[PDB]
Design a protein around this ligand. Structure first.
Ligand SMILES: Cc1cc2nc3c(=O)[nH]c(=O)nc-3n(C[C@H](O)[C@H](O)[C@H](O)COP(=O)(O)OP(=O)(O)OC[C@H]3O[C@@H](n4cnc5c(N)ncnc54)[C@H](O)[C@@H]3O)c2cc1C
Ligand SMILES: NC(=O)c1ccc[n+]([C@@H]2O[C@H](COP(=O)([O-])OP(=O)(O)OC[C@H]3O[C@@H](n4cnc5c(N)ncnc54)[C@H](OP(=O)(O)O)[C@@H]3O)[C@@H](O)[C@H]2O)c1
Ligand SMILES: CCCCCCCS[C@@H]1O[C@H](CO)[C@@H](O)[C@H](O)[C@H]1O
Length: 257
């Protein structure tokens, strides 16, 4: 179908890699949305899967942060992709993780686990995030330290850029944690928001309906627990049609891995 070419590839761990592809000249999307991408199976039939566009809406190229599931119909194949090869990329962007889907506010929270940081790798590089809000809080929880690397480097590259470094350094608050390995900050996003620990570590006021807006992206179980916690602070799930305090999107469907 619609074919695009891989321009670069980077493996982060034995189960995580990112790659950038050429962008369809017709593509127009909002930072945070996802599209369907895929490869042909052995019978020449499409293996399609939804993927958040990890790059900001203004980037000339498209980037994706992907898991590597051995025996995974798509990623067992995609994990071998090389520069110059191609993938199917359908330019029909959709998704609820968009600023327009949230009432204006002053503090924006990105709550993610595992590859769920993909749509935020996009939003953290979206000019609109820093224009419409005073602070942007990026909470990324993973089992191990290595899983945080892609996000760590991204946040690092932002807060250090010669041009917008000081700017971002002042509004972006990066809060990574591990739950299975030793790290300076640990614990689930749910637990750390509920107990109040994150508000203390970051030296900021607790969550409130009037100023806080959040985007949630992780496993279904994670999404449901974060919702209750957010609701415990008076926030309500919104909609692109009726904007409120928070929005959610599954980082993937199924059990775990
Ligand atoms: C809205 C939406 C957006 C998504 N965006 C991304 C993204 O940006 N990057 C990404 O890697 N995946 C993303 N996923 C998952 C993605 O669509 C595919 O599932 C992934 O490419 C795996 O495909 P597969 O055919 O190799 O394995 P599958 O048969 O699809 O899945 C086998 C099992 O692996 C697990 N799994 C699948 N994907 C993940 C993952 N992301 N993280 C942890 N476990 C997983 C689940 O338990 C799944 O049942 C997204 C899913 C949805 C529903
Ligand atoms: N059938 C089974 O008994 C079975 C099947 C598959 C995997 N697993 C186990 O699960 C592990 C893989 O990780 P996982 O799925 O538990 O994490 P996960 O969704 O893949 O995502 C990574 C992170 O989200 C956190 N998380 C998971 N559930 C959460 C929730 N309900 N609320 C808030 N945060 C949550 C995890 O913390 P935590 O580490 O505390 O989860 C982890 O930090 C493996 O170590 C494996 O041993 C068990
Ligand atoms: C003028 C630079 C603006 C801010 C850059 C810091 C983020 S880091 C940067 O982000 C770009 C956009 O996603 C990518 O194309 C690039 O490869 C990546 O290193």
């Amino acid at each position: 179908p619609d074919a695009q070419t891989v321009t670069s590839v980077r493996h982060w761990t034995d189960t995580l890699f990112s790659f950038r592809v050429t962008r369809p000249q017709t593509l127009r999307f909002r930072s945070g949305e996802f599209v369907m991408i895929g490869l042909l199976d052995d019978n020449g039939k499409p293996i399609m899967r939804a993927y958040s566009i990890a790059s900001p809406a203004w980037d000339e190229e498209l980037e994706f942060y992907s898991i590597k599931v051995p025996d995974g119909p798509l990623t067992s194949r995609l994990q071998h992709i090389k520069v110059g090869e191609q993938i199917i990329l359908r330019p029909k962007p959709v998704g609820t993780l968009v600023i327009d889907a949230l009432l204006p506010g002053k503090r924006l929270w990105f709550l993610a686990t595992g590859t769920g940081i993909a749509p935020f790798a996009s939003l953290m590089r979206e000019p609109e995030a820093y224009e419409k809000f005073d602070e942007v809080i990026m909470m990324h929880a993973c089992r191990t330290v290595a899983e945080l690397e892609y996000g760590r480097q991204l946040v690092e590259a932002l807060q250090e850029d010669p041009l917008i470094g000081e700017l971002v350094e002042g509004k972006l608050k990066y809060y990574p944690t591990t739950t299975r390995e030793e790290f300076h900050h640990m614990g689930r996003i749910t637990d750390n928001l509920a107990s109040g620990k994150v508000f203390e570590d970051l030296g900021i006021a607790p969550m409130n309906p009037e100023t806080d807006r959040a985007m949630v992206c992780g496993s279904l179980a994670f999404n449901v627990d974060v919702m209750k916690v957010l609701e415990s602070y008076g926030l309500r799930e919104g909609a692109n049609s009726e904007p409120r305090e928070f929005v959610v999107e599954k980082a993937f469907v199924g059990e775990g891995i």
